[PDB]
């Protein structure tokens, strides 16, 4: 315990690669190039403690559902068990996104290169969660219609692969003057609108919100935007600098919202499965 001893430092003495939020004035971990010191810091208080734990807790719970739901006892309750792949893809995305997020935050203070590597993973993780969310959702909403479903899926994956590849850029390019990573990110959010409305027109507006729960499900899209808008704005830190150094920062609320939103997606999505069994087609 007398190894890798460290103390919290103010924002001013931080290196540029650790300077990512000027509204967090104190409680920053000093750069420590040790994974042992980085993982041991999880059980200590600093600017990133909240971010670690929120997605660390989110990971375990989403991990349970993935495995618990995957070992469904009522395999008989599932028709035709082909459906497990659809749910599984979602869980991988949620689990990977969640695992990458807590890892990046923990190893954030290690070194500039390590921070860079894990940062790319965090970005890739978000794209995976979005990709994962669509497969279960698209499958059931277009359960009756195979041709529209296959087509919607290809777009998301192409846009999704594009997102991960653009963000990681391990193979080629960046950093660049170009803001194209944003274009691919734009693809993910936007691709969702064509399917969602398509579902409403085909099933009717009234039936889709009430039964499809799309309107009730509308909250999730709102939540993600709230989180995205909130994090960029950096509220409430912007309004009260130095008052949100350790708790209730924008990033942790955003981190919390991702779990709440992914869960809401799951509850809403599960209801869609019940809708499908009732009606073969119409």
């Amino acid at each position, epitope marked *: 315990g007398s190894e*890798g001893r*460290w*103390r919290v*430092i103010p924002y001013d003495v931080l290196p540029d690669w650790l300077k990512d939020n000027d509204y967090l004035l104190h409680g920053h*971990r000093p*750069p*420590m*190039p040790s994974f042992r010191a980085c993982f041991k810091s999880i059980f200590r208080i600093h600017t990133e403690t909240g971010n670690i734990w929120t997605h660390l807790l989110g990971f375990v719970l989403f991990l349970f559902l993935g495995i618990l739901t995957m070992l469904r006892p009522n395999m008989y309750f599932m028709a035709p068990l082909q459906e497990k792949v659809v749910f599984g893809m979602f869980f991988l995305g949620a689990v990977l996104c969640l695992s990458f997020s807590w890892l990046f935050h923990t190893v954030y203070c290690h070194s500039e290169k390590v921070s860079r590597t894990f940062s790319k993973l965090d970005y890739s993780g978000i794209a995976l969660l979005i990709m994962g969310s669509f497969v279960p959702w698209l499958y059931y909403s277009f359960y009756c219609s195979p041709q529209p479903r296959l087509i919607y899926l290809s777009i998301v994956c192409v846009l999704g692969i594009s997102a991960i590849i653009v963000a990681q850029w391990d193979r080629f390019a960046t950093p660049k003057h170009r803001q194209t990573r944003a274009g691919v990110f734009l693809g993910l959010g936007l691709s969702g609108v064509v399917p969602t409305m398509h579902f409403t027109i085909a099933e009717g507006f009234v039936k889709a919100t009430t039964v499809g729960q799309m309107g009730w499900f509308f909250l999730m899209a709102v939540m993600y935007i709230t989180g995205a808008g909130l994090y960029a704005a950096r509220i409430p830190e912007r309004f009260f600098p130095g008052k949100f150094d350790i708790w209730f920062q924008s990033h942790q609320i955003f981190h919390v919202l991702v779990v709440a939103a992914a869960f809401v997606h799951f509850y809403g999505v599960s209801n869609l499965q019940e809708f499908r069994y009732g009606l073969e087609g119409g």
Partner: antibody
Amino acid sequence: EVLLQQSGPELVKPGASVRITCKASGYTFTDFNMDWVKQSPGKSLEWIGDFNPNSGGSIYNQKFKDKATFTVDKSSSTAYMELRSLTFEDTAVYYCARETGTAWFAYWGQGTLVTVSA
Amino acid sequence: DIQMTQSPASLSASVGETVTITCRASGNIHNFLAWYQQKQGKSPQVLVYNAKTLADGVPSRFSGSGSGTQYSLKINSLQPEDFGSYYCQQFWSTPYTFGGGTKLEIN
């Protein structure tokens, strides 16, 4: 910028005790730990130990356990080190070094020369 | 207590030449190492910290490399003011220790 200022040269008799002063300016004094270093003439640096302004908690090298005691004045933003039962072996230049989260010293005092003569 | 062994005891080079100073630790110090330069009769100044991080305001000629028990300080395009004593220290474990030091001469 950050400045660490030390007291003047000290000439003392064996068995005497001396106090070294480190004056810290240009930064929040309580923000970082303060360390003390001893360099015997024509010799390498030795780590006496560290002191925490915030916790008033200090660690000493086994070699300097009884020899040195660290005290601090928060109002004056000044750190002190006390050397007792001075011996011949203690004739060295003494520095105060400020760490930055980890014990790497960006800032150093000019140093204090403690000369012990019979 | 970690023991820091510095190599060599002393060395010399001409202006513009490259010199490498090596430091070896008794145990793994996990990249918690710093390099200092001390001019005669003056307090030491930090060059590199955290094994490979250059301190602010330090000339680009100074660089750090290594992991575990072995670390190196490399000086490119040697300068007249670079003469002095160079030290390495480990802040990974208590008590914090310093290398014997390396004396540098410029021709």
